[PDB]
């Protein structure tokens, strides 16, 4: 560790991330907290979304922790693509690793209480969601709009990679999802990605899902799961199923990972700002503790990684239904480090 | 009245059509039917996939009825492109119907049982799932590969248009479901027709989800869905997942729809062909004969319809458990009739 950057961000941001930031100080004492003012605050003050003297001050640290970003006082699709979107650009945050465990002590929508226990490794500088394309004739009945995604081997190589070295460490099972038999070029990208990096790892078992029959089984057969890959449009989608099936986006942490390190990643929870109860001390901080946890792993702090990661599920297993206040279930989770 | 085509297909095509023809004539008296061999069958026979003169032959007839294609036997994707999405498009089977309920005697994977009675209204003839795209530098460090989705005015308005008036049937809700944020020329064009066309449907209430979040809704609280119009390719997704919270694709229907009626529609269980069970006797014939019912509610013919309903109920609502054979199903059907 050393410095980390953090953004607490907007609504409920900054009570999970002082909350976040107690846990990583009892961890790892003496780190270097800078404090940035980003998102609909930052937008309002100064009309800046991400001014790139700020990504310049975000590259001097080892590692951002993020809160939330949004409010509704702001523009639909704004912060989104021209805050959070550029900063997973401008800091070649190429991978978006999304766990889903499901824990004792929390509900799964699924009948049985299943044994969930995978990582989504999703693409996320590339792909459909760079915003190519364009219309003609809008507003009229002859109006044609055009989307497309571009996938390059540079980028689809880096995600695989990555993700074969995680089922390494894990269960040694990995699948890719994807959509190859419509998407063939994509696909077939995709998959010859996968079988050229999995010569390096005869000892992790690969296999292929479509998109759609993926979405079957992570409701069907989720324990089938260890390292899932897959690309940008289609990890969104499948990371957010994930995060349901594991009892909601509430409980669900993400990293955006350059693993080159030339640039910081960041840890944030999965869930938004949740403006309506903003500042009211009632939003959990268990997924943004669980970030935290996330970002000192990466850093190869693995023992305060497993501390926080024992804390949290100690906290989940004894909570129960009682009424928990933001900084009640911060305690309880120091309190079992 | 009625002249059906009918092409049993591939595997266990024939087995389960062999009911639902059985349930049909049963129903409605004078549907002259004509027999088509399509599939692996014609292929290995002729060399012939689809031809020109048979679409031509096709549109000659008031519906089409399939049972499945697709042989192990057959090369990848040479049936599937070339017989079934040439259908599609030849035919411009713009409207996809992909009906989600729940029966009583169905075991949803979700927890407790829920109400679950929706239908999903997917575009069927434009998108990425058309072969839009290449790639450069294959097999090299710099491929880069393409897809492209193709949206038009045109395409969206008349998918809106029929789902707006399946809702006012209905419980007169709509969620429209795309990824506005960041597919924005497709998504503003989705967004502006769904307003367009909605002005004159003032009994139906409109929602709006991104394709991530209807995700998590359908596996947390599917019972806010009545009618779910969305493109392509996220209806590809969203159609599987439907029919896995209702108890399978086993026992899903689906309509592929030209609702100018210029063109016949084709009616079709949603599962495959299942070589490995092919004249075993064994292969469910119910979803086949909810296609016949989704193919008699489209040709007007409601009370015949409305009756086979019942008949598919009653059978799902007292099977119990027992292992019957495609024709003991297949019998047990008519009783209700
Ligand atoms: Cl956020
Ligand atoms: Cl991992
Ligand atoms: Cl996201
Ligand atoms: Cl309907």
């Known amino acids: 560790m050393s410095k980390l950057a953090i953004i607490a961000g907007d609504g409920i941001g900054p009570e999970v991330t002082a909350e976040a930031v107690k846990v990583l100080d009892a961890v790892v004492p003496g780190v270097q907290k800078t404090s940035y003012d980003l998102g609909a605050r930052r937008f309002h003050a100064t009309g800046e979304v991400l001014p790139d003297s700020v990504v310049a001050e ?12 949004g409010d509704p006082s702001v523009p639909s699709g704004v912060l989104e693509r021209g805050l959070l979107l550029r900063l997973r650009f401008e800091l070649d945050h190429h991978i978006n690793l999304r766990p889903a465990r499901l824990y004792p002590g929390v509900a799964s929508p699924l009948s049985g209480n299943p044994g969930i226990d995978f990582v989504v490794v999703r693409e996320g500088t590339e792909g459909p969601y760079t915003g190519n394309g364009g219309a003609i004739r809008v ?91 897959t690309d940008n449009l289609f990890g969104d989608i499948i990371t957010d199923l994930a995060a349901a099936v594991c009892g909601g986006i509430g409980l669900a942490a993400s990293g955006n990972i350059d693993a080159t390190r030339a640039n910081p990643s960041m840890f944030e929870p999965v869930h938004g700002s949740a403006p309506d109860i903003a500042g009211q001390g009632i939003a959990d901080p268990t997924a943004a503790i669980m970030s935290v946890a996330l970002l000192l792993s990466h850093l190869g702090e693995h023992d ?34």
């Open 58 to 69: 975000l590259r001097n640290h080892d590692a951002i922790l993020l809160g939330a970003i």
């Open 139 to 229: 507003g009229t009945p002859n109006e044609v709009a055009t989307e497309v995604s571009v996938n390059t081997a540079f980028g689809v190589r880096r995600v695989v990679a990555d993700a074969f070295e995680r089922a390494r460490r894990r269960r040694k099972h990995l699948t890719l999802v994807h959509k190859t038999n419509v998407l063939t070029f994509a696909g077939g990208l995709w998959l010859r990605t996968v079988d050229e990096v999995g010569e390096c790892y005869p000892d992790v078992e690969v296999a292929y899902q479509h998109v759609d029959a993926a979405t079957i089984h992570m409701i069907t057969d989720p324990g089938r799961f260890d390292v899932i890959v």
């Open 304 to 337: 305060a990684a497993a501390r926080v990661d024992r804390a949290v599920e100690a906290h989940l297993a004894t909570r129960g239904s009682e009424r928990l206040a933001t900084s009640d279930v911060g305690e309880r989770i120091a309190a079992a480090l």
